[PDB]
Design a protein around this ligand. Structure first.
Ligand code: JKO
Ligand code: MG
Ligand code: ZN
Length: 313
C-alpha cells in the first residue's frame, strides 16, 4: 500500500517530458510503467501483485523483433502517460486505467509484418480477421492474458465499469491500425473547424482517443534527433525483412520495404512526416493544447530529415 516506485532523479524529472527515452536497461521498464500507472491513475487502481504479473505476461508475449517489441510497448505507454498528465481533468478514471494498459498491449505478439503481408502470405489470422488483422489479434491476446489466473487487474471493477474499460482498450488498440487514422483525423479536423466537437459525445471521445493512440504509436518522430534516427534503423530492419519475404512470394515490394531503395529513405521520411506525422500532432494540439511539445519535436525532426537530403548530414 505505502510501497511507492521511485526512479533516480534524472528519470524522475525527464519521465514527465514528451521526449523521454526509456533507456537501454530492459529490467527497469516494468518499474517505469508501474511508476506511470501510480502517478497517472493512483497506487490503489491496481493490486501491485496482479499488475506485476500482468506486465510480465505481456512482456513474455512480445517477440524479439527489431521494432514491434517490448521496448515499443513501454515507449508508446510513456507517450500516453505524458498526454494524460498534461490533460489532468479531461479524462475519466476508467480512461486513465484503460489507455496505459491499451498502449502496453497494443502490439502484443507482433511478428514484424504488416496486415498487407499477412493477406498476401494467406496467414490464418487474415482469414480470422479480414480488416485491422494484427490489431484484432493484439486485442484478442490482451483479453487472453487478462483471463490467466491472478492476471485480472480489473477484478475490483463493477460489471458495467469492466465492460466499459475493455471497450476503451478494444477501440484504442484497433485505432493503432494506421489505415484507419486518415479518415479519423479528417472527421476530427471537420468537427474542430465547424465547432461540432463535443467531448461529452462518446463517439467524439472515441475519435479523440483514437488520434491519441496514433500520436503515441508514431512518437519516435517526437524524440531527440539521435533517438528518432536510431529508432528509424529498427523500423527499416522490419520493413526490409518484409520486403525480402514479398520477393520470396514473387511480389515486388513497395520501395519502403525494398532494401535496394535504401538511398531514398530521407525523401520517404519527408512524405511520412508531411502525410501522417505532422497532421496527426497538429490536430491533436488543436483538440488538446498541452500536447504542443509533440508537434514542436515532430517539426524539429522534419527539419533534420530535410538537412539529411541537402547533404548537411
Ligand atoms: C518513423 N516512423 N514511425 C512510425 C512509422 C510507421 O509508419 N509505422 C507503421 C508501420 O509500422 C511501423 C511504424 C514510421 C515510418 O518511418 N514510416 C514510414 C512511412 C512511409 N515510408 C515510405 C518510406 C520510403 C519510401 C521510399 C523509399 C524509401 C522509404 N519510408 C517510410 C517510413
Ligand atoms: Mg500495431
Ligand atoms: Zn505500435
Amino acid at each position: 500500500g505505502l510501497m511507492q516506485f521511485t526512479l533516480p532523479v534524472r528519470l524522475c524529472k525527464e519521465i514527465e517530458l514528451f521526449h523521454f527515452d526509456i533507456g537501454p536497461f530492459e529490467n527497469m521498464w516494468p518499474g517505469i510503467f508501474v511508476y506511470m500507472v501510480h502517478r497517472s491513475c493512483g497506487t490503489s487502481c491496481f493490486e501491485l501483485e496482479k499488475l506485476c504479473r500482468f506486465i510480465m505476461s505481456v512482456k513474455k508475449n512480445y517477440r524479439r523483433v527489431p521494432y514491434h517489441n517490448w521496448k515499443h510497448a513501454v515507449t508508446v505507454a510513456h507517450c500516453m502517460y505524458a498526454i494524460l498528465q498534461n490533460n489532468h481533468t479531461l479524462f475519466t478514471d476508467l480512461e486513465r486505467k484503460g489507455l496505459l494498459i491499451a498502449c502496453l498491449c497494443h502490439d502484443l505478439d507482433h511478428r514484424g509484418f504488416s496486415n498487407s503481408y499477412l493477406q498476401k502470405f494467406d496467414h490464418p489470422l487474415a482469414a480470422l480477421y479480414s480488416t485491422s488483422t494484427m490489431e484484432q489479434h493484439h486485442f484478442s491476446q490482451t483479453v487472453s492474458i487478462l483471463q490467466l489466473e491472478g492476471h485480472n487487474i480489473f477484478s475490483t471493477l463493477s460489471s458495467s465499469e469492466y465492460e466499459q474499460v475493455l471497450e476503451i482498450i478494444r477501440k484504442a488498440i484497433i485505432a493503432t491500425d494506421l489505415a484507419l487514422y486518415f479518415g479519423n483525423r479528417k472527421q476530427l479536423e471537420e468537427m474542430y473547424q465547424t465547432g461540432s466537437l463535443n467531448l461529452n459525445n462518446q463517439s467524439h471521445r472515441d475519435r479523440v482517443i483514437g488520434l491519441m493512440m496514433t500520436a503515441c504509436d508514431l512518437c519516435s518522430v517526437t524524440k531527440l534527433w539521435p533517438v528518432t534516427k536510431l529508432t528509424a534503423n529498427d523500423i527499416y530492419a522490419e520493413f526490409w525483412a518484409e520486403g525480402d519475404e514479398m520477393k520470396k512470394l514473387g511480389i515486388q515490394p513497395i520501395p519502403m520495404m525494398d532494401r535496394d531503395k535504401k538511398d531514398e529513405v530521407p525523401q520517404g521520411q519527408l512524405g511520412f512526416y508531411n502525410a501522417v506525422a505532422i497532421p496527426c500532432y497538429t490536430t491533436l494540439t488543436q483538440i488538446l493544447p498541452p500536447t504542443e511539445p509533440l508537434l514542436k519535436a515532430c517539426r524539429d525532426n522534419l527539419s533534420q530529415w530535410e538537412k539529411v537530403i541537402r547533404g548537411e548530414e
